[PDB]
Design a protein around this ligand. Structure first.
Ligand SMILES: *[C@@H](O)[C@H](C[C@@H]1CCNC1=O)NC(=O)[C@H](Cc1ccccc1)NC(=O)OC(C)C
Length: 181
């Protein structure tokens, strides 16, 4: 195996999980310890179904910027026996673009799915489903419903979480390392 394939597959094995909430199927990224992140519109409750079992959520934090604007990420703390492989080192310190990125998706309906979204560019403001959203990036790929939560990766870096699209383009909430300090 080569390095990019090894890194994405290792992500899938160790950090990228199949989940279901009242809102349906999402991909969840486990970041470190018992901390994971999901798209805010997943609306996780007191418990979330992860892979094969119902897991209790100890805390949820919906991220907003200084202006009070939605970042579309929710940080959840899980009541789990053991800790996620810490991948904060692979998340850049500031929101970063990339070339030839891959979107990694893992849902019961779309298990271990790799989508070659291409170049990921700065986008900023986005209005999705009526909610105004900052710090997003864009890829020119017609991503689908069911792909939210999907992890945007390139060259050994984890840079975003898929949050929507418009039938021609896809968007992610950018990730920065300080969200997970
Ligand atoms: C995953 O949640 C889903 C994926 C979209 C559907 C088509 N392309 C995609 O990749 N995203 C959405 O459904 C969001 C919903 C959203 C976003 C932010 C805040 C609240 C809800 N987009 C969406 O519904 O698109 C509108 C143009 C209808």
């Amino acid at each position: 195996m080569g390095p990019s394939l090894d890194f994405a597959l290792s992500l899938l094995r160790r950090n990228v999980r199949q989940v279901q909430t009242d809102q349906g199927h999402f991909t969840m990224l486990g970041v470190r310890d018992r901390l994971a992140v999901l798209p805010r519109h997943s609306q996780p409750g007191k418990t979330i179904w992860i892979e094969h079992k119902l897991v209790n959520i100890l805390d949820a934090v919906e991220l907003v910027d200084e202006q009070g604007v939605n970042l579309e990420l929710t940080l959840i703390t899980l009541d789990t026996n053991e800790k996620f492989r810490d991948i904060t080192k692979f998340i850049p310190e500031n929101i970063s673009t990339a070339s030839d990125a891959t979107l990694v998706i893992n849902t019961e309906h779309m298990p271990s799915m790799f989508v070659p979204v291409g170049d990921v560019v700065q986008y900023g403001f986005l209005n999705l489903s009526g909610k105004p959203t900052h710090r997003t990036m864009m890829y020119n790929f017609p991503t689908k419903a069911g792909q939210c939560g999907g992890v945007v990766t390139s060259v050994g870096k984890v840079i975003g979480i898929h949050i929507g699209g418009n039938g021609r383009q896809g968007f992610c909430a950018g990730l920065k390392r300080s969200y997970f300090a």
